[PDB]
Design an enzyme around this catalytic site. Structure first.
Site, PDB file in Angstrom:
ATOM      1  N   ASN A 224       1.724   3.111  -2.584  1.00 49.17           N
ATOM      2  CA  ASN A 224       1.145   4.069  -3.521  1.00 49.17           C
ATOM      3  C   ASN A 224      -0.138   4.635  -2.920  1.00 49.17           C
ATOM      4  O   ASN A 224      -0.438   5.820  -3.070  1.00 49.17           O
ATOM      5  CB  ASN A 224       0.860   3.410  -4.874  1.00 49.17           C
ATOM      6  CG  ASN A 224       2.022   3.549  -5.838  1.00 49.17           C
ATOM      7  OD1 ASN A 224       2.389   4.658  -6.224  1.00 49.17           O
ATOM      8  ND2 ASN A 224       2.611   2.425  -6.227  1.00 49.17           N
TER       9      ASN A 224
ATOM     10  N   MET B   7      -3.137  -6.448  -8.002  1.00 47.51           N
ATOM     11  CA  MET B   7      -2.509  -7.535  -8.743  1.00 47.51           C
ATOM     12  C   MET B   7      -3.350  -8.495  -9.574  1.00 47.51           C
ATOM     13  O   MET B   7      -3.042  -9.687  -9.660  1.00 47.51           O
ATOM     14  CB  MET B   7      -1.610  -8.324  -7.791  1.00 47.51           C
ATOM     15  CG  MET B   7      -0.470  -7.490  -7.217  1.00 47.51           C
ATOM     16  SD  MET B   7       0.723  -6.783  -8.588  1.00 47.51           S
ATOM     17  CE  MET B   7       1.829  -8.346  -8.852  1.00 47.51           C
TER      18      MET B   7
ATOM     19  N   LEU C  85      -6.409  -8.432 -13.148  1.00 49.89           N
ATOM     20  CA  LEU C  85      -7.058  -7.645 -14.182  1.00 49.89           C
ATOM     21  C   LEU C  85      -8.484  -7.258 -13.838  1.00 49.89           C
ATOM     22  O   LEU C  85      -9.212  -8.018 -13.200  1.00 49.89           O
ATOM     23  CB  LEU C  85      -7.052  -8.416 -15.504  1.00 49.89           C
ATOM     24  CG  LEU C  85      -5.678  -8.707 -16.109  1.00 49.89           C
ATOM     25  CD1 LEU C  85      -5.829  -9.651 -17.293  1.00 49.89           C
ATOM     26  CD2 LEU C  85      -5.021  -7.402 -16.534  1.00 49.89           C
ATOM     27  N   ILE C  86      -8.863  -6.056 -14.256  1.00 50.10           N
ATOM     28  CA  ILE C  86     -10.212  -5.552 -14.049  1.00 50.10           C
ATOM     29  C   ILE C  86     -11.045  -6.186 -15.156  1.00 50.10           C
ATOM     30  O   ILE C  86     -10.670  -6.129 -16.331  1.00 50.10           O
ATOM     31  CB  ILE C  86     -10.264  -4.017 -14.196  1.00 50.10           C
ATOM     32  CG1 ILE C  86      -9.520  -3.362 -13.028  1.00 50.10           C
ATOM     33  CG2 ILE C  86     -11.709  -3.549 -14.276  1.00 50.10           C
ATOM     34  CD1 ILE C  86     -10.129  -3.648 -11.668  1.00 50.10           C
TER      35      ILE C  86
ATOM     36  N   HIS D  47       1.913   1.966 -13.862  1.00 48.50           N
ATOM     37  CA  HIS D  47       2.706   0.824 -14.291  1.00 48.50           C
ATOM     38  C   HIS D  47       4.183   1.205 -14.321  1.00 48.50           C
ATOM     39  O   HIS D  47       4.549   2.249 -14.860  1.00 48.50           O
ATOM     40  CB  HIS D  47       2.217   0.403 -15.676  1.00 48.50           C
ATOM     41  CG  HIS D  47       2.822  -0.867 -16.177  1.00 48.50           C
ATOM     42  ND1 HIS D  47       3.854  -0.891 -17.090  1.00 48.50           N
ATOM     43  CD2 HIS D  47       2.534  -2.159 -15.895  1.00 48.50           C
ATOM     44  CE1 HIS D  47       4.174  -2.146 -17.352  1.00 48.50           C
ATOM     45  NE2 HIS D  47       3.389  -2.935 -16.640  1.00 48.50           N
TER      46      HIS D  47
ATOM     47  N   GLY E  94       0.759  -1.237   0.000  1.00 46.99           N
ATOM     48  CA  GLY E  94       0.000   0.000   0.000  1.00 46.99           C
ATOM     49  C   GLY E  94       0.794   1.294   0.000  1.00 46.99           C
ATOM     50  O   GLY E  94       0.284   2.326   0.428  1.00 46.99           O
TER      51      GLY E  94
ATOM     52  N   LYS F 299     -14.800 -14.048 -11.474  1.00 48.31           N
ATOM     53  CA  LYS F 299     -14.413 -12.653 -11.349  1.00 48.31           C
ATOM     54  C   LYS F 299     -15.673 -11.805 -11.470  1.00 48.31           C
ATOM     55  O   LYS F 299     -15.835 -10.813 -10.761  1.00 48.31           O
ATOM     56  CB  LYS F 299     -13.414 -12.266 -12.445  1.00 48.31           C
ATOM     57  CG  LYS F 299     -13.094 -10.778 -12.482  1.00 48.31           C
ATOM     58  CD  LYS F 299     -12.018 -10.464 -13.511  1.00 48.31           C
ATOM     59  CE  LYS F 299     -10.696 -11.113 -13.132  1.00 48.31           C
ATOM     60  NZ  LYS F 299      -9.608 -10.747 -14.077  1.00 48.31           N
TER      61      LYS F 299
END
Ligand SMILES: [Mg+2]
Ligand SMILES: [Mg+2]
Length: 188
Positions: free
Chosen positions: A15, A91, A93-94, A110, A13, A66
Site C-alpha cells: 500500500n 499492525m 493500534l494508535i 481496512h 509495504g 506504547k
C-alpha cells in the site's frame, strides 16, 4: 503549502508503494514525507530507501509502553512538519498520544465494508462468515477500533467456490487504487 504525509506500515509495504507511485506519476498533490515502521526488517523499509522516503524505524521492545514510543514518534512527526498520517498495514493500534496530536488527521485502510467485520484479519472474517460480498474502506481513525467515520468504500464480491487467495488479490488490487485516490482528495 503542500500537505506532508507520514505513512505507518508494518509489513510488505504494497500500500505504501501504491501511494508513492501515485505521487511519483503526479497524481498525489502531497509529499510522502515519512515512513513509520514498528517492525525492523519489514520489506516496506527497503521500499522507502529505494524511493528516497525518510523512515523512522523502531522496535516496541525497546520501550516500556506504547506511550513511550508514541512520544518519540510524535516528536519526530512534528519536527518533520507532518500534517497527516495514513495507516497502511500498520499492525497495532494508535494510542492517545498520537490520536490527540493528530485528531482528525489520521486515516486507515481496512479490508472490509465497515462497520461490517472490524478488527484483525477482516478478509478472513468475511471469507469464514460465508457472505457474498465484502469490500475496502478508508476511514478516519478515532478512539475506537476501526470505528472512525467512513471516508470512502469499494464493494468487492466474494465468488462462490473460489479460494481465499482469489479474494485477497482482488481486495489488494482495490486497496492500491482506492487509497491513493482518497488521499489525493483529502490532501489536495
Ligand atoms: Mg497521467
Ligand atoms: Mg533512539
Amino acid at each position: 503549502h503542500m500537505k506532508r504525509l507520514a505513512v505507518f506500515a508494518s509489513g510488505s509495504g504494497t500500500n505504501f508503494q501504491a501511494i508513492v507511485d501515485a505521487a511519483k506519476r503526479g497524481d498525489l498533490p502531497a509529499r510522502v514525507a515519512l515512513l513509520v515502521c514498528d517492525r525492523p526488517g519489514a520489506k516496506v523499509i527497503e521500499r522507502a530507501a529505494r524511493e528516497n522516503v525518510p523512515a523512522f524505524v523502531f522496535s516496541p521492545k525497546d520501550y516500556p509502553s506504547k506511550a513511550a514510543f508514541e512520544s518519540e514518534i510524535l516528536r519526530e512527526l512534528k519536527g518533520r512538519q507532518i500534517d497527516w498520517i495514513a495507516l497502511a498495514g500498520y499492525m497495532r493500534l494508535i494510542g492517545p498520544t498520537l490520536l490527540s496530536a493528530y485528531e482528525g488527521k489520521i486515516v486507515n485502510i481496512h479490508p472490509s465494508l465497515l462497520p461490517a467485520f472490524p478488527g484483525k484479519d477482516a478478509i478472513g472474517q468475511a471469507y469464514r462468515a460465508g457472505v457474498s460480498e465484502t469490500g475496502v474502506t478508508v476511514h478516519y481513525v478515532d478512539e475506537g477500533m476501526d470505528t472512525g467515520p467512513v471516508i470512502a468504500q469499494r464493494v468487492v464480491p466474494i465468488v462462490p467456490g473460489e479460494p481465499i487467495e482469489a479474494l485477497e488479490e482482488r481486495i489488494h488490487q482495490v486497496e492500491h487504487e482506492l487509497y491513493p485516490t482518497v488521499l489525493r482528495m483529502l490532501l489536495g
